[PDB]
Symmetry: C3
Subunit: 269 residues, 3 copies
């Protein structure tokens, strides 16, 4: 169980994550409205949300997404797209652990995700902080589904501590680093990380523990099935580093469960 | 077992479905020969078959194929290509059920398949009906492998009942809609649906029943193995909505079985 | 166990194979250095290795790779990229056996691999033999990982016997032909084939024996695990056509093992 307020935020940023997949939302002119196709992001359309920055084929690994200004909810939203291109999938396969001493000592992160973020950090950091200067009353939120959630998590860890809080909402995100990084993500201040999983989705189980990967805490686990609407009672908070009993169970994983986080996600053309 | 006459049709249109994958057959000039690479479609090449309309990157979902005029067999063949592009695959994943009451009452169909067809139906109907007018003694046949088989099925159900029969030959096609639609496809008049499957091919088992999908009846189940020539005694007719004992068995599915329908299907460059 | 000299050769050409995946190494000016990204080919970078010819999207099947001049080791290295593009994967799925009598009598090879090589054989033979004339004391070596190893295996069998030795180092290569071709690859004069496999990598088990495919002898089998450094004591030579007890064992296969051949291979962007 989560509060209705937190449920509304989980639902909203799942739609911001879904919107990042739509092709027209990766080269949109600044100041234009954020829209999706196939009812992918109704709540985002209802809001007075526009593009501050729209990017695709950026850095290494085909970083893609947009930076949004939400005047209704008073948000600065950085939404990363998940895997769609061949270049995205190849970056996922770069799963050896690389030192990220510039984030925390003893921490190691997925080579692919960390390399991709490093390659766009300077540009996007400047875009976000320009927005905070213009709208200092707003709230900064990084979000993304799958690979996009892994990027939103790494980015949040790297840019926190510079005067503005950064909340992160990831959906079906894979493990991003070793246990040192997982513990750091669990105790870091300057914003909250909401790591949302769904039933037996396979992606949050990758890369496997045996390669040295761990999950941060807590986990918000959606128990309602695929194609089933989600209510605030279907989400379970699960505390503990590499906690079992949520998505991390010793049962058969599922691929279609990876595409149902409050609605269909990853399928917007 | 099936008759030799039906076996000959099953083999012929399996090769028309293969020709649709060949890139050269998706942007060819009208009136030119239909040819394939290797021995992908020797029976089509032997016929006096020419392009009426060759299309690619059409509508939504990257609809690809050709409309052919076969003077040897007296056919008007609309052949849809199966999955190859990333865009084809994103469309396959839009597996929510959408209303198609214009086709039949209470029927619901795969969102992607029905949205792809709807985006090209006006253009293709006109070309099919132009050919029927000029060649009223020719037989209209929609066909396709995998996704293409799903598009042929939908297009056939949508255009039937306008004066001319439309027969559909689908190979390794997934489920396309709900039970209402599966029953409509079973009893619809004005043409016959030949839904063909091969051993334990995985694709006719998608999307899973649990998501609300059913299969029309009957099923023509190829029992011979992969890379094994098919004889008319290897094909078994299986009647009953969502019938088991054919491809729909609770065993381990197979991927290479998806590519062997009389010959190799889906591999023409 | 293998000798430290052979181990060093196995390690060097694993990095030449890894280099072929980097996009910048498929369209580089002749004479420029060969480099990779993130420690993918450190030994290649240390060497005085420059491009003689880089190719991409060549022939049929998206043949990709480079021809390198290594002055440090006195090598002419032809490195084929493995699977990355959709076109690559379609070619892999063309797995029926085709006559390659011009290479060896009674031999039959994978249709995709042999068609891909035939479509570039005249261009690449000219490039290799030009380099031989220019540096007649250098050693010619074909190498590749996965699909690249299969192309390197077929190319060496075709181009041997024209006045110079061709050594082949394949990593995680699939079976390329029938038994006759497997025997020929075992005994052919004018160079050596080092076929290297890793633990229970699935790819060297494809296509299955039951489709008529056989593996040449010997097999150099890496017993250390994924993400585990390799030492010369972890490699075991296994002789015999279609020998078991190495990679060819009736146990569960593994996909990540395919990417670890002394290091991460297939992941360079
Ligand atoms: C459009 C997307 C369509 C949905 C399909 C989702 C595919 C999920 C798989 C990649 C997700 C990308 C993604 O974001 O993360 C995947 C990546 O982190 C995993 O990298 C790997 O280690 C390889 C995984 C390959 C899948 C094989 C399954 C088992 C792997 C472990 C084997 C055990 C080790 C023993 C040796
Ligand atoms: C993993 C091997 C690769 C397969 C392909 C995956 C990535 C494809 C992207 C590019 C592909 C290029 C074109 C290649 C064409 C031939 C290759 C495609 C082969 C797969 C085709 C899929 C259907 C096509 C297709 O038309 O898609 C059907 C569409 O309705 C999607 O349906 C879904 O709901 C998505 C399901 C995704 C996979 C679900 C996993 C299977 C579930 C069962 C698990 C298996 C365990 C069973 C054992 C139980 C017994 C104990
Ligand atoms: C993608 C772009 C970059 C490559 C990254 C992915 C590479 C992964 C390699 C492994 C994939 C398999 C084929 C690749 C070989 C390369 C390659 O070079 O292909 C070799 C070729 O000879 C294979 O030809 C075949 O016979 C096709 C076999 C298809 C097998 C697909 C297996 C993938 C996963 C499916 C699991 C089994 C099905 C469910 C079982 C359920 C049991 C209950
Ligand atoms: C370019 C080409 O091959 N055109 C052919 C022609 O050679 C052949 O006589 C005829 C028979 O169908 O079909 C067309
Ligand atoms: C970096 C560059 O442009 N060229 C280098 C050159 O500086 C170096 O002396 C030589 C030694 O291998 O390799 C090449
Ligand atoms: C976008 O929405 C805002 C109001 O929220 C306003 O600029 C206008 O109605 C919309 N503009 C376009 C081009 O749709
Ligand atoms: C992230 O790598 C997961 C891929 C997103 C799924 C897109 C729709 C299948
Ligand atoms: C149906 O979705 C088509 C799947 C076959 C892929 C083409 C053959 C490589
Ligand atoms: Ca709006
Ligand atoms: Ca002809
Ligand atoms: Ca160098």
């Amino acid at each position: 169980e989560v509060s209705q307020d937190l449920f509304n935020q989980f639902n909203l940023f799942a739609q911001y994550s879904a919107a990042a997949y739509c092709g027209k939302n990766n080269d949109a002119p600044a100041g234009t409205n954020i829209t999706c196709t196939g009812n992918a992001c109704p709540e985002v359309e209802k809001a007075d949300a526009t593009f501050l920055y729209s990017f695709e084929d950026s850095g290494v690994g085909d970083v893609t997404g947009f930076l949004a200004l939400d005047n209704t909810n008073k948000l600065i939203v950085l939404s990363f797209r998940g895997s769609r291109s061949i270049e995205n999938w190849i970056g996922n396969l770069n799963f050896d652990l690389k030192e990220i001493n510039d984030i925390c000592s003893g921490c190691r992160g997925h080579d692919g995700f960390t390399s991709s973020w490093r390659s766009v950090a300077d540009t996007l950091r400047q875009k976000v902080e320009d927005a905070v200067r213009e709208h200092p009353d707003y709230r900064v939120v990084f979000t993304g589904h799958s690979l996009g959630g892994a990027l939103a998590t790494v980015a949040g860890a790297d840019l926190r501590g510079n005067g503005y809080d950064i909340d992160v909402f990831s959906y079906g995100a894979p493990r991003v680093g070793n246990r040192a990084f997982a513990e750091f993500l669990t105790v870091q201040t300057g914003g909250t990380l909401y790591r949302i999983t769904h039933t037996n989705d396979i992606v949050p189980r990758l890369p496997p523990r045996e390669f040295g990967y761990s999950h941060s805490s807590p986990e918000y686990w959606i128990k309602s099935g695929t194609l089933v609407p989600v209510t605030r009672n279907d989400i379970v908070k699960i505390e503990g580093i590499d906690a079992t009993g949520g998505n991390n169970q010793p049962n058969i994983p599922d691929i279609p469960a990876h595409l149902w986080y409050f609605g269909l996600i990853g399928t917007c053309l």
